[PDB]
A paper describes a structure:
The population density of E. huxleyi is restricted by Nucleocytoviricota viruses, including E. huxleyi virus 201 (EhV-201). EhV-201 virions infect E. huxleyi by using fivefold vertices to bind to and fuse the virus’ inner membrane with the cell plasma membrane.
(F) AlphaFold2-predicted structure of EhV-201 major capsid protein with double jelly roll fold. The jellyroll cores J1 and J2 are each composed of two β sheets named according to the convention BIDG and CHEF. The transmembrane proteins from the EhV-201 outer membrane bind to the capsid; however, there are additional interactions between the major capsid proteins and the outer membrane. The loop is predicted to form helices α3 and α4, which are 13- and 20-residue long, respectively, and are positioned at the outer surface of the capsid. Therefore, we speculate that the amphipathic helices attach the outer virion membrane to the capsid. The abundant capsid-outer membrane contacts may enable EhV-201 virions to withstand deformation without negatively affecting the infectivity of the virus. The reconstruction, because of its limited resolution, did not enable identification of minor capsid proteins mediating contacts between the inner membrane and the capsid, as is the case in other NCVs such as Tokyovirus, PBCV-1, and African swine fever virus.
Residue numbers in the entry:
A (entry chain A): 51 to 491
B (entry chain S): 1 to 663
C (entry chain S): 409 to 663
D (entry chain S): 205 to 255
E (entry chain S): 103 to 153
């Protein structure tokens, strides 16, 4: 059953829905998002050219940030050089930078000159995985208490690690695996996205949320929406972005969303048994530590609580965020942003210093259904952190005085044009949801 | 009970985040808000709400006249395209065929006349202009012919018969008293009135659609909506297409695209330092210079020139730039260093741009001189700009989106009611010196009736003007007596303002297509030229009431209701007094920062408040607010909202709050 | 500089005056150095020029007198160059530094024919930067008037044309005074009032006497009290200045 | 100064802080900054914790 | 046909080549650092005026 929001849905706003009681249990939950098709027009041809600024490919802030790190390695008259000569000098300076920083062997200049064949026409498109990016934060509330919180960055990390082969969310969230031409094609028409909300009760039928056992509590989904300026990328800085059908400038009121819920109807005997004794459900809750990065050495103090199953972490460059590439967790020149990490409990090494590949590939190989295609790192205390019903290990962070994740990042990470890069750390923790006398807590 | 002072700097409007020291982060404490040191830093007008939207009359042009609707039949599935063409405000007659044996004349037009809607759904062909008599205000002529030897002629629309898309039949007897000679080669103009409102335009489009489709404009919403009318049972609306008019009416969720925009500078307008009414008037009159004003500049030779700009309406920044360029080059006499002055639109903008002054050699703009024109008209700071060959304005200026203002506005606050009034000035006729007459076109230099100096006329291609013999000089005129060209017609002489591709657009040079008369005998003499003054509509919305007008100053602040307010005489008055005073600020917690806070204070919407900050520091201390926290608190977020629900603007001011916690 | 408060916005503006060129009477020319006595263009009286060694000046033929000049007509030395004549202000070790005596290294021309005649001397006007900080925001600018009082943000504000304007209105009005106990004078005081930083307050004194009486403040003392200390802080966290004024407080004690 | 240092060393002034800071640029991998000296300009830019 | 201009003080126009970089003209960078229309360099004492 599809249900409208109780408040208006708009870009950059917060909206909520009170979930209807149309069955005995609540199972699957999808945010149904409708995005308009995009068109572009020159600002000179527009009767009202005043719109929010969007990221533009003629002003690639990520490429400019990467060039800024190699400027000290450019030999010769860069300022006066022809465009083709500047591209050669930048590719040679990249070899000199990478030799000096990483002892890398030089790549042939022709192999570094990847022309992305960008189309010779004007366009705008919705950013990669727009269905996740739109959901800056969602909160599942029962009786006014927040039971769990999910973030855009966590949803993406969860799909990277737990997304099964042949069941990746690609079309359902507007994800193309960084193929700009496919984002452009999709963005020319109306898009309907079905973003799964991975709450504890959506993971297994025995965890379905017992609506009948919580009769005296309102169930609410709250969603904080992304700002419109962050959702769109355009070919050129001087273009106005239009709603393709309405032929008006795109505005914050053009976001449409509804909640699609799967209800379970029970036989009277099972319904009555569940109403009399729903008892307790084991739940997984999410916790977040969000930090700005301005140095190559970063210590994150993880003030998480409860029995933690696992945590995820990853970095986002300021330049990647400003370019509208919100799920690009790569470092400078697309490298791995982490050199090494260490995990400390009460200043004692729980995991001694390990290289990035161990946290990214070995932890994913041991504990996850998939290896991440992006620079997402994980660590599990659980033997099976994807099993929603069988506890298989945890560390109780409410009994540790300090938990520190110490990171050594790549050289010049968080310097200059990347000042205020972001560190995300998300933890999954066990808690218990109790149902008693028509109340849930 | 420890008291803690929390200090924060707002990074966003309306939101402050506070970190609780770990010594106090125990479970289940009540926090009493004791005091807030509030900065009162919010401006009367902020950069987030500084727009006013207005329009004059809607002109129908060849590029903006048509709406097409694709209809699908419900039974057959057949597709029928339905075209509404609105009649042009001015359409040229290119031929007049003489009398068939019945005494009918055929008038052939340059553009499709649009007077007859095609018969559809078993309806007869409908005369669209015949409906103007019921839609327009009483006394508005639905149709005028220009170029009669006797002057302009009002013709009853019901006397026209359809011939084809480019020509109409009329009985010679209907027009006999007035048709005595169209001149050899200029057959005159068909003129229809400009639309005072979007609502009147929608009624004409509905009539041109034979009421098969209904267009309605909702003034409270500022939205045009389209509905199936008489075809509702037989057809479904599949799609809508058309020219710039269809896009303007329907392309923006029904919001009309032809609103002119003014941006007010952010500031304090409640303390009498800044006059909001004068600022609105100055921003509406951006291309009108009240008095002759001087541009002072110096060349490489060290010689200083003063350039006197003509007073009047330039209409567009390009006409102003070109006038400045022309006058600088005439005054400097120096063919070796031509000054170039242009208005340049910003990349991706159709209507925002900057003035750019360029020469081959370095020159100085003496904009810090008190005898110089206010440089803010050109988007420059009032300082001397020296030692460069190129100067570009710091501030972005708005060019007109569709048609430059034909009116000049006064904006004033009505004494004793404190209501804002946006009123057009009395439009003064201009005197035109006859320079020449050729091919039905009269060439005129426009002059100020009081001083006799050149005057910028503000008129544009397709403007309809009335021509009279030179009127007596106004009382207190200082200029020399002008020799008037005398002409007589039975009716008013009207003319259509035409472009001339061969003459530089001096804003004081006016070219008018006029009836064939002895105008060549008037070369060197003067005539008086008058044009009709337009209505005004103003669109104002409070924050969040409309998605398109979201950056509007707010209807309630200016004493307006949310929606469109129209003044048929070019005068709009607010319903209520202007209220620019600082308002109370509601302080609440951001939802999801806490699982349960109890408060004793609620706003009118039932939202839980911590406290309400008074309008100013003099109204008293901020009321104490008791808050109970059910959980251990590491951080909390406060929301600060204006009474309209908009976020409070801290303008980089810091805020400090004192909370007492229970033990 | 002129410093003014902008009407209607109440923003402070620090703006350079229009730098007026000075007329220089040619006294002599020797060794590439032109010696000038500087005079007021309006009155013809001696004028102190404010120029220093290494200042770069532009030299022009005597400009027309300003409108409303009361001085006698000055005979101008006429010279022509393809480009602007510039010169560098030099010290002269042999002449007393009269602030109206100006010495300029200038291109070799017939300057000796101009002795007794006048030329006009102009110099470039500088940008301005202003550093303003609220108390405790910077250790070096600690004695600054406060950025917030003058409507500035904390930091450096630069005006490329020699004009700086505050971001906000000037606020010189008396502000509320937070009253609290000094930590360590008491092992536990409970209050119902907290400031925005979570600091326990006894009361908040209003900005002025006209805003009303000081709010009553309940304080519980857990111990026998021989003495207590009160802290009085401005909203910026700076200490309140009593200027040798006495203060009286009335407290009611429970039995 | 950064350009005169061939971007081997980067000088940045932070207007909000009113502070000049010096960082290793293109020499960051090969060299360590041991000390800073110079005339009245070096003292003026760096002698007062970058003020 | 080259002229040598000798200065009273060290001219400071050329930063020494270091870390395998060529000698850099420091004044050439003024064109990108200073506001548009600021001349990076002027000669005074030309018979035709400043250059």
């Amino acid at each position: 059953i599809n249900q409208p929001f109780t408040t208006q849905v708009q870009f950059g706003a917060e909206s909520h829905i009170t979930v209807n009681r149309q069955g005995d249990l609540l199972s699957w939950m999808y945010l149904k998002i409708v995005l308009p098709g995009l068109k572009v027009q020159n600002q000179a041809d527009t009767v009202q050219p005043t719109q929010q600024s969007f990221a533009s490919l003629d002003n690639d802030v990520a490429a400019q940030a990467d060039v800024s790190h190699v400027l000290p390695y450019i030999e010769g008259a860069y300022t006066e050089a022809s465009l083709n000569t500047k591209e050669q000098l930048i590719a040679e300076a990249k070899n000199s930078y990478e030799a000096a920083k990483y002892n890398a062997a030089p790549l042939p200049v022709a192999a570094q000159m990847q022309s992305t064949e960008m189309p010779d026409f004007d366009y705008a498109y919705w950013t990669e995985a727009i269905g996740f990016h739109l959901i800056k934060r969602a909160e599942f509330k029962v009786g006014g208490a927040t039971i769990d919180t999910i973030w855009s960055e966590l949803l993406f990390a969860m799909e990277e690690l737990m997304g099964r082969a042949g069941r990746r969310l690609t079309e359902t969230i507007g994800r193309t695996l960084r193929r700009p031409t496919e984002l452009m094609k999709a963005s020319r028409q109306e898009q309907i996205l079905y973003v799964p909300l991975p709450w504890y009760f959506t993971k297994h039928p025995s965890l379905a949320f017992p609506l009948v056992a919580a009769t005296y509590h309102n169930i609410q989904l709250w969603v904080q929406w992304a700002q419109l300026n962050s959702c769109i990328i355009k070919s050129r800085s001087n273009l106005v972005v239009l709603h393709a059908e309405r032929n008006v400038p795109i505005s914050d009121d053009h976001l449409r969303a509804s909640l699609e819920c799967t209800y379970v109807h029970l036989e009277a005997a099972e319904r009555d048994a569940l109403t009399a004794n729903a008892g307790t459900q084991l739940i997984v809750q999410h916790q977040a530590h969000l930090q700005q990065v301005s140095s190559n050495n970063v210590t994150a103090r993880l003030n998480f609580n409860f029995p933690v199953l696992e945590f995820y972490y990853f970095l986002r460059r300021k330049a990647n965020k400003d370019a509208g590439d919100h799920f690009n967790f790569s470092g400078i020149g697309g490298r791995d942003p982490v050199v090494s990490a260490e995990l400390l409990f009460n200043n004692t090494a729980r995991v001694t210093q390990k290289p990035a590949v161990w946290w990214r590939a070995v932890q994913a190989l041991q504990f996850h259904s998939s290896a991440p295609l992006t620079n997402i790192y994980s660590y599990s205390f659980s033997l099976s952190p994807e099993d929603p019903i069988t506890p298989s290990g945890s560390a109780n962070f409410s009994r540790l005085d300090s938990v520190e994740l110490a990171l050594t990042l790549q050289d010049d990470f968080g310097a200059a044009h990347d000042a205020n890069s972001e560190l995300f750390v998300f933890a999954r923790s066990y808690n218990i949801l109790k149902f008693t006398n028509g109340l849930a807590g | 009970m420890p008291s803690i002072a929390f200090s924060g700097i707002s990074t966003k409007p309306g939101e402050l985040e506070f970190h609780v020291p770990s010594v106090l982060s125990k479970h289940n404490r009540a926090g009493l808000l004791k005091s807030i040191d509030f900065p009162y830093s919010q401006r009367t007008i902020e950069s987030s709400w500084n727009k006013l939207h207005y329009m004059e009359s809607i002109r129908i042009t060849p590029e903006s006249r048509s709406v097409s609707v694709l209809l699908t039949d419900k039974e057959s599935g057949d597709r029928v395209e339905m075209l509404a063409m609105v009649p042009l405000t001015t359409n040229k007659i290119i031929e007049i065929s003489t009398a068939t044996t019945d005494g009918t004349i055929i008038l052939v037009t340059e553009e499709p006349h649009g007077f007859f809607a095609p018969g559809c759904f078993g309806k007869e062909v409908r005369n669209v202009i015949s409906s103007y008599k019921s839609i327009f205000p009483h006394g508005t002529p639905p149709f005028i012919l220009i170029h009669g030897s006797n002057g302009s002629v009002q013709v009853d629309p019901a006397l026209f018969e359809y011939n084809d898309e480019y020509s109409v039949k009329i009985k010679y007897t209907a027009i006999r008293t007035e048709f005595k000679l169209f001149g050899k080669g200029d057959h005159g103009w068909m003129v229809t009135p400009e639309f005072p409102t979007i609502s009147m335009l929608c009624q004409v489009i509905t009539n041109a659609m034979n009421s098969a489709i209904i267009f309605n404009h909702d003034d409270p919403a500022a939205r045009t909506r389209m509905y199936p009318g008489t075809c509702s049972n037989t057809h479904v609306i599949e799609s809508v297409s058309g020219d710039s008019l269809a896009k303007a009416l329907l392309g923006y969720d029904g919001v009309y695209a032809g609103w002119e925009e003014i941006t007010i500078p952010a500031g304090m307008y409640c303390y009498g330092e800044l006059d909001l009414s004068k600022m609105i008037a100055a921003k509406m009159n951006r291309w009108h210079i009240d008095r002759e004003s001087s541009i002072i500049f110096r060349g490489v030779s060290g010689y200083t020139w003063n350039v006197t700009l003509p007073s009047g309406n330039y209409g567009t920044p390009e006409k102003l730039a070109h006038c400045i360029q022309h006058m600088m080059n005439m005054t400097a006499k120096n063919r070796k260093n031509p000054y170039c002055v242009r208005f340049t639109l910003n990349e991706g903008s159709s209507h925002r741009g900057k003035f750019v002054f360029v020469a081959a050699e370095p020159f100085d703009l003496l904009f810090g001189d008190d005898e110089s024109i206010d440089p803010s008209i050109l988007g420059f700071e009032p300082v001397d700009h020296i030692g460069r060959n190129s100067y570009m304005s710091e501030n972005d200026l708005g060019a007109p989106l569709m048609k430059p203002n034909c009116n000049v506005y006064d904006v004033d606050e009505i004494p004793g009611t404190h209501q804002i009034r946006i009123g057009r000035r009395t439009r003064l006729a201009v005197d035109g010196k006859i320079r020449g007459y050729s091919g039905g076109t009269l060439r005129l230099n426009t002059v100020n009736r009081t001083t006799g100096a050149p005057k910028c006329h503000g008129m544009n291609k397709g403007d309809v003007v009335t021509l009279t013999t030179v009127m007596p000089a106004p009382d207190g005129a200082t200029g020399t007596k002008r020799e008037g060209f005398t002409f007589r017609a039975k009716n008013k002489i009207m003319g259509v303002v035409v472009a001339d591709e061969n003459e530089n657009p001096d804003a004081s040079s006016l070219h008018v297509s006029v009836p064939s008369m002895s105008w060549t005998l008037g070369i060197g003499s003067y005539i008086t030229i008058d044009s009709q003054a337009a209505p005004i509509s103003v669109a104002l919305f409070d924050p969040g009431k409309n998605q398109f007008f979201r950056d509007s100053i707010g209807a309630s602040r200016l004493g307006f209701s949310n929606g469109v307010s129209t003044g048929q005489h070019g005068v709009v008055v607010s319903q209520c007094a202007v209220n620019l005073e600082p308002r109370t600020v509601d302080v609440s917690f951001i939802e999801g920062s806490m699982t349960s806070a109890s408060t004793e204070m609620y706003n009118q919407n039932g939202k839980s408040l911590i406290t309400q900050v008074p309008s100013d520091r003099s109204s008293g201390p901020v009321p104490q607010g008791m808050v109970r926290f059910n959980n251990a608190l590491q951080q909390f977020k406060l929301e600060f909202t204006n009474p309209d629900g908009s976020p409070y603007h801290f303008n980089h001011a810091s805020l400090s709050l004192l909370m007492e916690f229970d033990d």
